[PDB]
Amino acid sequence: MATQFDENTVITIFGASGDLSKKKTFPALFGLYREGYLNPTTKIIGYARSKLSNEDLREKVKPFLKKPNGAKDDAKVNEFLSMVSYHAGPYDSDEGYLELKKIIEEFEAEKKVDEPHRLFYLALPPSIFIDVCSKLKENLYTESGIQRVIVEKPFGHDLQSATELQEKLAPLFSEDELFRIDHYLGKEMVKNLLLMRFGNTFLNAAWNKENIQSVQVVFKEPFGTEGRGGYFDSIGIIRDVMQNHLLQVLTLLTMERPVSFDPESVRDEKVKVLKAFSPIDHDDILIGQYGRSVDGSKPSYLDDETVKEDSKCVTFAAIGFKIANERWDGVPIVMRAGKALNEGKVEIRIQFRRVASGMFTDIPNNELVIRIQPNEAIYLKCNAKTPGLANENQTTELDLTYSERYKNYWIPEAYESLIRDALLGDHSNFVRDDELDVSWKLFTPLLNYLEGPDGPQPKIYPYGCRSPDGLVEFLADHGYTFSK
Ligand SMILES: O=P(O)(O)OC[C@H]1O[C@@H](O)[C@H](O)[C@@H](O)[C@@H]1O
């Protein structure tokens, strides 16, 4: 019921010369075009301070456009580049925006446009958002068209900084025009979660404290922070992926059902469950920093020449959560994220309860695993009678590998899906301001405690190991029952 952007839409990518723009934003715009979801009358404008030409931009991004049909669809590559142009100018001053206002109004007149449709993708750090947002609002805002601006996380590093950014942003652009990106919300398997649970009685009837023993959201990466240790030092793993990506996923797994079809009904339920989270217990935590591999082949986090040697930076964290409402009361929830472990994986693991006594209880807990990445899949640990004369249980792993169906369909990348959604005006996969506020109210006390003077020292774990010491115990302390 929001207006869709199709013909004669102008997409301006601010920060167009940067890494994010050339490796992600423009490649995503192309993928949408290559598969027929970007209208050919779309004007794509890259804006940045440097003084490059239309040729420079096109040749800068060309190495990153994806050709899944190989040398085929090469006309599409050149087709797309021909829709892309460049304008140089400062973010700090009105002359660039007035010059841009002229390029755009020229195009919106050469095509008979009664209602300008303008998307501004801000591929910039927040310290430059507010300037550009001011300038767009002072110079390039039409009360007789519709404009939408995309910004990407982070929006702050704690409650105070996030509040300050939003205080400056709110008088410039409303929630309806703002599209705040957490790119996990564009991943195919993350987008399936709501319909998977709410659309299937076989899961929804069990999705409650009466049947769930343990909820886990799991993030593992096999590499470390080498080279960028000094930057990561003020971030840490909790800020990097847990406060945003992992919290988003958990929110989709625990919210109640949206009662209407408005995208804001999705967002209302996410905010609602966020407010029911109890405060984080600062003791119910497992904090780790990666040391040298047992190998000797891999450096410690501190071996990084850009990291001070007394650094308490957390590169692995497991955190317990509790949600105080009727569905979740007393269910222990764990989010755990680490760099420099043994594999790359993002995964949801839900363990169901067993009855304590009776005939079909000498049997392992049912379990549901949803792999978000790498190999999108759903697995169910099930129980069944042994076929034939035998009257014993055997546990069966049911495979719902999505590779079956995906070799048939076009599965967009996160940014492709997300830009599409913005063009269609659908806020379902974007962060709202109260969502941001509550998520920072939840994590800031933990972050203040860890980074203050009494901040605990992370336990060291070797690069490449499965789990820091204490993890398996931590999980069993949070309702996970291990089995054969
Ligand atoms: O899992 P994805 O889609 O590759 O995203 C993971 C990355 O997400 C970013 O937000 C983090 O800052 C990175 O540290 C992390 O590696």
Swiss-Prot record:
Catalytic residues, chain numbering: H245
Keyword Methyltransferase: no
SUPFAM superfamilies on file: Glyceraldehyde-3-phosphate dehydrogenase-like, C-terminal domain, NAD(P)-binding Rossmann-fold domains
An example Gene Ontology CC term for this record: cytosol
GO MF term list: glucose-6-phosphate dehydrogenase activity; NADP binding
Residue positions binding NADP(+) 2: R336, K345, R349, R371, Y379, L380, K381, D399, L400, T401, R466
The family this protein is said to belong to: Belongs to the glucose-6-phosphate dehydrogenase family.
HAMAP family cross-referenced by the UniProt entry: G6PD (MF_00966)
One GO term of the biological process aspect: pentose-phosphate shunt, oxidative branch
General function of this protein: Catalyzes the rate-limiting step of the oxidative pentose-phosphate pathway, which represents a route for the dissimilation of carbohydrates besides glycolysis. The main function of this enzyme is to provide reducing power (NADPH) and pentose phosphates for fatty acid and nucleic acid synthesis.
Pathway entry: Carbohydrate degradation; pentose phosphate pathway; D-ribulose 5-phosphate from D-glucose 6-phosphate (oxidative stage): step 1/3
Top-rank EC class of the record's enzyme: oxidoreductase
The enzyme's E.C. designation: 1.1.1.49
Catalytic activity: D-glucose 6-phosphate + NADP(+) = 6-phospho-D-glucono-1,5-lactone + NADPH + H(+)
Pfam families: G6PD_C, G6PD_N
Full protein name: Glucose-6-phosphate 1-dehydrogenase
Recorded superkingdom: Eukaryota
Binding site for NADP(+) 1: G15, A16, S17, G18, D19, L20, S21, K22, R49, K153
Binding site for D-glucose 6-phosphate: K153, H183, Y184, L185, G186, K187, E221, D240, K339, Q373
Sorted UniProt keywords: Carbohydrate metabolism, Glucose metabolism, NADP, Oxidoreductase
